[PDB]
Ligand SMILES: Nc1ncnc2c1ncn2[C@@H]1O[C@H](COP(=O)(O)OP(=O)(O)O)[C@@H](O)[C@H]1O
């Protein structure tokens with residue numbers, strides 16, 4: 083009952099959705115839209131199976147783009163340090179085989195065996211990639227099947243299985259020109275092609291300006307980091323309950 | 330024979346254990362600790378072995394003990410139990426003795442005098458007590474070893490307890506029962522025995538090359554990768570591989586030096602003297618002296634690191650290689666690297682699995698080897714793009730995350746970076762914006778704390794100033810003090826920014842903000858440099874004077890006053906009518922304030938503070954007799 087009441091106080095309160103957004107990476111100032119977006123990504127939708135046999139994705143993919151001053155890697159660090167299952171990786175460091183699946187020769191026999199890549203690890207969780215625009219196109223392609231079908235298909239050297247890849251991809255990247263070329267439009271500043279853009283259910287571009295009223299507050303509290311609603315443990319307890327409802 | 334006498338040595342230590350003091354410093358050392366040891370629920374003592382060289386007879390024991398360390402320690406174990414029993418029940422100070430009496434203890438000297446180094450040892454020096462130092466790299470998993478063997482008679486189920494002596498297994502020939510006496514009936518049960526932990530830890534040893542250490546019992550997994558280590562153990566080579574049976578491991582100046590430090594700390598020309606003394610070969614460059622010096626002082630580390638990094642955007646003929654080559658020597662030992670001759674693997678690492686250890690092993694690259702220190706990256710403009718991508722996470726989290734085939738892990742490479750970069754082309758071109766003279770992307774160019782534009786001008790007057798400095802230097806503070814100062818400052822001072830210093834940062838940053846490339850990256854420099862200045866000052870808080878001077882240093886390093894706010898170009902020259910009017914208006918007001926006060930004159934110090942909230946203007950008035 084005490085566990086029930088503690089978990090209940092985070093559900094049956096009239097402002098909980100407002101409260102929980104302000105409880106995502108409290109060190110990062112501003113960017114109130116991404117705090118809603120990630121929180122929704124952390125509660126991915128209902129998986130459905132058609133009476134015809136087709137299955138429907140329930141997880142949510144999110145991409146974030148900002149200038150090199152806008153703190154975006156902090157969000158990925160928070161997610162990988164908070165999520166039940168999570169994996170952190172970088173754009174240039176990662177590779178196709180390391181992300182999806184590794185074909186490795188197995189012991190106790192002469193036949194191959196899969197090794198869990200980055201996506202297979204933290205399955206039914208959130209996968210995080212930093213500096214997404216730095217990734218090669220040829221190894222960005224390998225994420226495509228996992229982003230929508232939530233499966234990995236392998237046909238390489240005597241292996242033909244299909245593997246569960248129910249993962250919510252979270253990514254961060256920077257515009258093609260380093261800074262946001264504010265002369266142009268959103269259509270021209272991103273090198274991400276149409277297919278990958280369509281898959282991301284949410285897509286944020288956050289910009290910075292020389293507004294004094296904002297910078298004074300921004301400088302005020304980032305200094306407090308170097309000077310020094312619901313707790314971070316409460317959110318996992320709430321999510322372990324919320325993930326059950328199927329509206 | 331044995332240099333150790335069973336009764337002589339225990340008597341000699343007994344005198345030491347009850348009479349030792351260092352020279353309130355007069356209090357005896359172990360007269361206090363003996364009660365504390367009886368309080369402890371521990372099973373061993375890390376003996377303060379530096380006391381052995383602090384007392385006369387103990388050093389004589391050390392030389393005698395140099396070839397027989399095991400026997401005394403075994404005697405001390407019983408002595409410790411006897412000392413416990415005597416202090417508990419014989420002194421009647423305690424009564425909990427049952428577990429202590431039955432169990433076994435050990436003793437570990439930790440600060441014995443070091444030997445003549447590893448490679449200088451000799452075949453007779455094998456099995457002798459030694460003291461070494463090094464860096465731990467890799468650890469093997471827990472390997473159990475036999476201590477007790479469990480035998481059951483396969484025809485009558487009788488059980489024997491057999492213990493190994495000197496690494497020998499003795500198989501019973503017949504069952505010990507009176508009736509059952511079948512030969513060879515005794516059988517061994519693998520999982521009814523008793524085992525002890527054995528671990529092999531790899532150390533990169535620097536003699537007073539890498540040596541594979543060995544640990545046992547509670548000493549296993551106490552040493553992990555990257556630990557800074559001093560070794561107190563036994564050099565071993567047995568029929569022949571060189572290894573050390575570690576007995577204890579350590580996980581890690583005069584008052585006259587303190588007087589020497591304070592003299593430089595007190596003198597007013599501190600900053601002037603440091604610039605004058607840091608680089609005799611390099612002339613002037615006051616800010617560049619302040620720049621690299623503040624890199625070596627570093628900011629405070631909180632959990633937010635103080636790894637100040639600097640870019641030298643100077644012309645490609647100013648002595649900057651003459652600096653960073655010299656920096657690599659004067660600084661506490663780091664690594665000298667060139668961006669042209671380095672790669673992502675060369676800087677970070679090569680990581681692979683091991684069949685024996687069954688966990689990831691690392692081959693440290695250039696960047697990781699500088700963990701906690703300072704590294705120099707020449708030819709930064711020529712670094713490969715893949716390698717440059719590494720620095721983004723390095724200069725934001727000091728970590729590197731790798732996710733490739735079969736390997737998914739993150740490392741730590743906390744270090745300071747000193748970067749020098751020639752301008753695009755054969756020389757700097759001020760006719761172009763500064764951000765276009767530098768071949769670095771804005772994301773990478775913004776995260777540097779300090780960028781210095783060192784330009785050489787063809788002036789006959791300034792040529793003689795530099796020329797006569799060098800030409801007489803090659804005719805015919807020391808580095809020891811300088812390193813002693815820096816190590817002292819890093820050791821003690823952890824300044825905290827005051828309330829007054831905090832508020833001034835807001836106006837300083839906003840002023841650069843409204844003139845826009847003033848990202849929040851440069852706000853990191855507005856605290857990192859502030860702490861490093863107080864640390865040089867040895868003041869345990871960051872002063873507002875440190876704040877404003879550091880802001881000026883950033884301004885002077887980037888040359889904002891000589892930079893066009895419109896297109897970012899630089900003035901070549903950096904009597905005017907604006908100078909005239911300011912002097913005219915200043916002179917007009919001085920003539921009033923000097924006489925508006927109810928006196929014919931006043932002190933010029935008070936007059937300056939009255940109007941500045943000047944000497945030339947009043948001198949001209951004196952020339953005109955006003
Ligand atoms: N809203 C904010 N709250 C706290 N810190 C911030 C904020 N915005 C920027 N920062 C600071 O500025 C830096 C921005 O770096 P970041 O944009 O994460 O680099 P990268 O582009 O490599 O991810 C961060 O280290 C962060 O500490």
Ligand SMILES: Nc1ncnc2c1ncn2[C@@H]1O[C@H](COP(=O)(O)OP(=O)(O)O)[C@@H](O)[C@H]1O
Pocket residue numbers: 610611612645646647648649650651652795799
């Ligand atoms: N201000 C200076 N002080 C001392 N030596 C200088 C100075 N300017 C140039 N030099 C000399 O010019 C030569 C050029 O070396 P340096 O500028 O350090 O690297 P680079 O040759 O790549 O430009 C050096 O041998 C150095 O002794």
Ligand SMILES: [Zn+2]
Pocket residue numbers: 482483484485486487504505506509510511514
């Ligand atoms: Zn028997």
